[PDB]
Amino acid sequence: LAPRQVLDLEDLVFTQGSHFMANKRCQLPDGSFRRQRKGYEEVHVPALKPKPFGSEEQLLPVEKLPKYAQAGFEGFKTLNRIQSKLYRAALETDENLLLCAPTGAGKTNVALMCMLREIGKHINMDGTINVDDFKIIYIAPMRSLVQEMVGSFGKRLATYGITVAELTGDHQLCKEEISATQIIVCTPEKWDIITRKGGERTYTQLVRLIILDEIHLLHDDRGPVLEALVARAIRNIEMTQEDVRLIGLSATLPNYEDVATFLRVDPAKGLFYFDNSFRPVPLEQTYVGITEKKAIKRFQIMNEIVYEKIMEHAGKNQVLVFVHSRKETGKTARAIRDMCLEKDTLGLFLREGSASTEVLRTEAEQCKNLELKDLLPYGFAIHHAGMTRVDRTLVEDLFADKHIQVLVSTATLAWGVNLPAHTVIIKGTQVYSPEKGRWTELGALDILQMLGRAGRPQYDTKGEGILITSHGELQYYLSLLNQQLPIESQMVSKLPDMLNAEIVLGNVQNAKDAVNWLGYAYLYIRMLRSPTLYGISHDDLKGDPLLDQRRLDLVHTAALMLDKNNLVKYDKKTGNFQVTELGRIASHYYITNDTVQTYNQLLKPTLSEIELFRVFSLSSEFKNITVREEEKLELQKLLERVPIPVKESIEEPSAKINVLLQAFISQLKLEGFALMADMVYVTQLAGRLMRAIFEIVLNRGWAQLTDKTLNLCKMIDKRMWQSMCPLRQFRKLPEEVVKKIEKKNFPFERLYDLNHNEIGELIRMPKMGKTIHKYVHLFPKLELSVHLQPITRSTLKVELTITPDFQWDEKVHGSSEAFWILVEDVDSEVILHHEYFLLKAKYAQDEHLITFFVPVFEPLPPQYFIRVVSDRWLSCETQLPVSFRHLILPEKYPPPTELLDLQPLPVSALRNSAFESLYQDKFPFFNPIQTQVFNTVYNSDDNVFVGAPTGSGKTICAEFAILRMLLQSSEGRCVYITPMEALAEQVYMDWYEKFQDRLNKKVVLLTGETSTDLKLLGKGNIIISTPEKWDILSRRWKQRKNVQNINLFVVDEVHLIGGENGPVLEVICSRMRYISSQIERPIRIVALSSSLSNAKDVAHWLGCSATSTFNFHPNVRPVPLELHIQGFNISHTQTRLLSMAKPVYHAITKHSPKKPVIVFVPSRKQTRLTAIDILTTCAADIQRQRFLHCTEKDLIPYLEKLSDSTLKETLLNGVGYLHEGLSPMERRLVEQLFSSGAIQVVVASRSLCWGMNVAAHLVIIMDTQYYNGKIHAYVDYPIYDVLQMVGHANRPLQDDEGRCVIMCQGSKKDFFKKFLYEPLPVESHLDHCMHDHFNAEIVTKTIENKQDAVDYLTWTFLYRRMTQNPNYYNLQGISHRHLSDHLSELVEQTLSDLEQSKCISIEDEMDVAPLNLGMIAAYYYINYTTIELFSMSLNAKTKVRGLIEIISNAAEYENIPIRHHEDNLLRQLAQKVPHKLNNPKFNDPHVKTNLLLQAHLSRMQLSAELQSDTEEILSKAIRLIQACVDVLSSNGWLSPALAAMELAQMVTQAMWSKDSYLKQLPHFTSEHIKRCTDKGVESVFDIMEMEDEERNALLQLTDSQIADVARFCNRYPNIELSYEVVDKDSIRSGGPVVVLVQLEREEEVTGPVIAPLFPQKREEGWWVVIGDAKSNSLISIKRLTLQQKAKVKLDFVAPATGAHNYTLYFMSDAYMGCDQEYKFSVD
């Protein structure tokens, strides 16, 4: 860091702004002549003769340019000279251009050619244009110019089918229909504001081309805005590494080549400069300058000058007279009218049609308003933006058809429309500037544009340009209009405000980056090329050619200002910058840094409305405003009429600004023309300044001032006071009708309770009654409902339900309405919590559930208030008290168990040498938690709880308990449960190699199927399982011996009991406790957990003493964690995500530049995007490959495996990523490289946070929400997922500390600050999941009566918490009476539900018994509502089609998620599948499971996540189908039962009901089968009996293909069937009939069922069925799995009268074409 020096900026700045001329000298063309007059002097420069054509360079006729570019040039047959000299550069290259041409030369159509080139790269063959793939931004300088640019461009690109729309003004949070526009047209200041936001990439992602029209605005006071835009754009292009083409369009002024440098233009390829010869129509010009200072006489001179120049054009010649006041237009038109008539009606009949050549047309349109009507009968007309509206557009008409001879207009016309006159006269050049608080000389931009309206391109060969101005000082205008006024940099003027925008953006983090930023500015180039202009000496430049000192000084000076005004924290030493919230707001709302200081110094929570209007007045953007003498009176009359007192402020600027704002809200008409210009200036600014004060004050939680300031923003926008009728906000309601309701002492709210007749009677306007009714019901209105529940004594969880109660109209509300959810304390003094809420039109009249947490303080208040205020509408709010009167706070939690700084335990504390051998090579001692826990877990047989921050190494704490069991028992039995499967598979691998390879005990992992799980539980010493797998086993604990005699039972992550799928965990742990006390040979419970606030309750529950319960606080974590929480106030998720991109990189460089980093992102697509962004930012930081820590050839053997191209590319650059579309191998590979240190950064999706055996030094969580398609909203990550992610920032061996940065919405910030720094409180949710467990317990006779059900509950964790946190479970009170009452009402409701669902029977009000439906639900582990639904929907006539629908409606498929835009995807799927659904909602998980079920049968391949869902669906499809069989057989329906069995075999093989049986064979296709049906092969048996040479002769093959096909036929069921009727003769009506089926196969069975498309290995299952096919009668059924051979017995009851015809059916649940049928008869 080099020494610095503070500069005087007011000395280096070009004070005079745009009017600055560094052009000390000057020259003139050939015609020099000047005429001296009395009062003034005339200067003449003649129109340049046209330059002869150069070598070739002929005009390019439209046919020459490409066929696709033909369109958009209708009306043209050839291109202009300019447009031809660069058709090649514009259309055939992508090079950056800078075009210098005179105004009117047609630079427009050059830019259009550039635009058409971009459109040309998305022609799409037959589809019109890939319109959603690109975007073009067009920066124009004036608002009026923008609007007509849109008009014209739309006319040219309609044939292309392209949307070009305006984006300028103040419309904040601009509509997402900008996604529908491809050419955004705007002003620089607007585009600067949009790109200051951060999420800019949401707009600019697709921007392939930006155009800078009238780029010579650089020299203007507005110039820095242009410098910022381009410097920002250029830098962003470097950071995305995505090409954006820049086109500069400029007027012919000096320094242009330096602008070409600025725009990264190649001088040789993309620079074009054309002098004044290339004007559209040659211009003869007069520059009259007045030498007379006397004010009144000065303007008489001027008026005399206008007069005589007009008259040199009598008949067929039009004159435009530009002036500089909305009203001066008339006082000049009538003045020349007074000048002409007075001197003998001078040259009248301007329209030389005394007999109506243009009089008949000018008197026919005469009935248009005020001054127009006056001047219309003859040649005079007028034009201004003075709200003249459609008149001025029909003045454009008549002036176009050259009827109107003389038009005097404001500058607006010159930019706004395309009408040129033969001669133009500009009068005065003086302009009032509200910002400077005075008159100044007008903008170079303005002059150039209007003077370039001289000479009609088609109707004129010459143009006359008269510029009237003051003689003194002004040949400025001559050099301006004759290629001589240079373009300079004004950057010093606005340096601190620009610096701040770049700091807030994250683009500059310190002084160093700041001087680099300056290097991208236009200022830099100019300081190098003209150091003397910019206050630098040639000697400084010589010894410092890059201007390091100057740029550092410049930056340091600015930074000091920003630090002083509290926008930026800046220290002299490091040169580092820190953004403050004040700076963030200042940048975003474009407010100068002086103002921020004032606001900060003045705003306080008790500001009055009177004082708030004062603070607005003191804003620095008003600092030059004064109170003139000639307005003193009008100001005093305004004051009396406005409502807010303006105290102590006499007529000072402060007071004037104050009443100017009030007068604007009050809609008071003005007459003072200086005053009107000042009002437009403060009122156009008032929106942003107010909104800035709003955000400042909202963020400090200031309740009263947030209300005041928000209302103030709404009042300025709606132009009405808060105390008028809300109905004024509807524009289409006649204003006198509204003032009529205000004239009553009548609350608006009451209109809701009146019909259209009572309303009409109230206003005594009967006609108006119905419309007022309509609008009353259009007004936004929300209803609120709250659901409260205490989490701890300091915090409560709040579920706010928001219910829209109004009629939606898109003409009034548009596509959405926004609201602020605020929660305030009792006194309404503090905002405890707030958040934005967006009510989309799509989901109006739809419930909305917002969940959040609020703080509370032990001497509790009676109420909090929740207000939901609209962000745009006045008087649109709804309030809801939240009573704390009956609130019961939870029991205060005990202190954490003290961490004992013991001497670290050595590995030799394990005495066993075999045991030590698997720890000694990794580490010498155990961590302080491991050593403290050691004596109790390794030298006891008793129950223990371990609560430590995730990462503390709790895994081996359980390993202690396992080793200790192995010591005690030879063939010990240990069951380990983890809530997550991905965790189970991780511990398996880790313990298999530890306990089976090293120690040779058995380690097994339970699976989906029960039989093979029972054997695994048999021979296993270590049983790994998830809770449901163990639930389905341990239900039958009475019957399965192996479940009882287990020695050690381990539960990991027991805090997950509080989460989703937590009840099943709670059930099985409780069962294990019950078994233990009921067998009197205790089972050892070891429970591992994250730090719990309520560990005592978990300890008591699992039978742990306090001395054997270890619960450590998060701040005692072996490796100290440094946690940072970073909020982003951005509601729109996709935007928020994008704006996190840079902070992600900055976190890596700040917190872990050398050590490993994991970045968690919310999705698959984001994982790839984030990694690519890190890479591209790396390269723009010039440190490309800085995350690679080996050579490329080190990686290449591993990368060769991978099949993702992009994954190779990123890894090659040091960054990996992990999503679920990668192979399990590809993921193992990436993890290996990461752990090795080779690659420094992995980006992973959150779903993978459980299945990653990888640790970093820095974990970054990039957003904490994900999309829920089911409720059309983004929802928060479970705190369990976040805790798990954070636990990854943990490397005990190498790191002194772990770091974690969590990036989230501001609405989520306070939440993380609580539940990450403190132990986590957990509750049960078993009460909302009670049915399936009661049903199972009743089926196994563990529950026989109501009392047993109450007793069962005493073993749960639910039972414990109910006393501790009653209001959480809806216990109104904590007495023992309340507990029993609740437990009883709970068992009552559950048992009554189970009975109504036909699962159980309640008898004598106390006893319960299992029924058929209950028994099948427990047997297949199916939810009770599912088999309730099955029995409800199944009938005698259901086919496979209805079966699929029924099964996909199961409640197990309720948790199949709907993801972002999966609806569009599923809608397409619906049109591709065989069966079409009726009224299908595409955000319905059951609709999706249906579609996926058909997609799987049709062998379609889909998105990766749709295939994961297809796998989840299939993982349950078989058990559900078997249930259907059971229910159908119970009802005795034959056909549906057989159908369900076909479904099982056709789900397995993944084929349809009438698909060829050959599809089961590998490698076969419809191409193959076609030649198989032709020869006569239809069955699998038919290829089986074929002899080898003939077999592969049928079609194509390979040695490996035939090998697989043959392998299939050796596992295919070759079974022979044999049957007999036992005592077939002595059988009688009503008696028993016994059918004995013998099954045997000519093969010894070994090998699972082969089914590549079914993702769960299953064994052959069979149904033996007997039926009557005539009556559709299922007589008897049996389900079996046979192995080699087996005897099957099944009986039934004989009917009457002898002979009956029966059928025996043999049915697979795994293969098609195996089904055998045998018919027979009896009696």
Ligand SMILES: Nc1ccc(S(N)(=O)=O)cc1
């Ligand atoms: N402007 C703004 C402020 C706060 C939030 S918040 N609290 O919802 O994140 C969003 C936008």
